Amino acid sequence: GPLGSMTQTFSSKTEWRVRAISAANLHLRTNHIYVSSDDIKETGYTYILPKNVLKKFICISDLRAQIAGYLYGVSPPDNPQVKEIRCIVMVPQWGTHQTVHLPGQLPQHEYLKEMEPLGWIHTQPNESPQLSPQDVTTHAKIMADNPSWDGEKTIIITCSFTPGSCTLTAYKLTPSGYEWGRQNTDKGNNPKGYLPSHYERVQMLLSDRFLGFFMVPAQSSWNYNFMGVRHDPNMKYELQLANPKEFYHEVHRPSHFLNFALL
Template sequence: MRPIYIFVNVLTLKLQESNPEVVELNDSLVSKDKGDTVSGARKRKRKRELERMRLWRKSTLEINELIQQQQIFIDSDNIANTDLKYILSKNILTKFILISEMQIDVTGHIYGISSSYDPGIKEICCIFIPNKWAIYQFNVYSFEQISQYQFKNYEFFGWIHTTASNDSSELSHNDRFFHTNFVHQSQQGQQQDQRVFVSCSFTPDSVSLSAFRLTSIGYEWGRIANAGKANKLKMYSPSHYEKVLLLVPDFQNNNVCYR
């Protein structure tokens, strides 16, 4: 026959699965035996798993609510006078938002095609989300993956990433460093003036998007900063980057995000 304390331990675990809020209350009913120490660890692990499930469910509901309300805003203030225009169809953007996390940065590589009659008009047809080595830092991706994946002869345009910051009107320090490395290490530097960075910010009631590109001065500043030559680094200037026009039309693009 089983000892009574083991029977109580099994009973509390079953109660915990049906009602996770009684985890701490059941600790006083379990004997302080070696076997009960293991069960306590299992209960704490179970509680953490349920907490992660609650956060994931809450984030999913919030994102779905933003999509249903069509609260998507494009930052079009102070657009640079260039011929570049990037077109991102709403269904691809919606797919990217739905598979993203509001608390974790998610980065994707942007691929598309240029217009035959106007090379400055670029349609984003695919967002590829590579593997990431960390959770809360987006600048830990493998740059070699860019050359490994080519989708239907699409051109590589740049990258997009989500952020929990409410301000997407300026390019952050981390984004500048990463974008410079992104262009140089991916062997895409021959067209660096056409490499775009799209910031997707989750604000309390909407999703805000801004598109940037680094100027030649900005690339040189980022190259020196990434090389660790701080003594030769000049003060950062807003002239190191400029905004480009990003359009989000309602037409449906048959391509989606790849993960």
């Protein structure tokens, strides 16, 4: 062994570069979107998700850090059992591979006043045969702070990155689920009291028949995964009618640009 005869010099290879290159190719998956229909029968309403905003949601996402959008919609005049998702709202947020961090404050905009809240959609690195206990906790605590979320009406759509594609599956909480989730302070993967009888799958269908839209923050962007210190559960935000920027867009990571010029 050599102390100086074979000296070599470490060279940094930062983590986000690889994930940025990976996020650039996400558009390839928007043409292989599969909805899990595994539930033999349906419990709840039937939720219809327009492809256009689903594709944008996938495209603005990251393969590891979860992102989330709030779902707003209405029932078609015909039958109240169908819930058409009309809008996805992106709010200031950060996340890990397991969970998302959203502000306490729900979306508030006049443009949304004639629609009802339907829950939320979020990405996941891997398919799971079960709804996450983090997700149950998150949905339950939102319901506990916001009586406009009816447990028989608000859902969680998971968008999991299967290789080459995306798999969507939709859940709703059960009353036992809400009661456990709202008192759960264990953020791990196997918390005490977690039960598969805390959620149940709902029927979901992708559509091209109509188009949804996005709302985004009025002065910030939505992605705070690079500004984590600046994000706070109690932060307030307004909204505007515009489309969201992609995960690695320059306005989401300004320190990468200002720091490089300091070399």
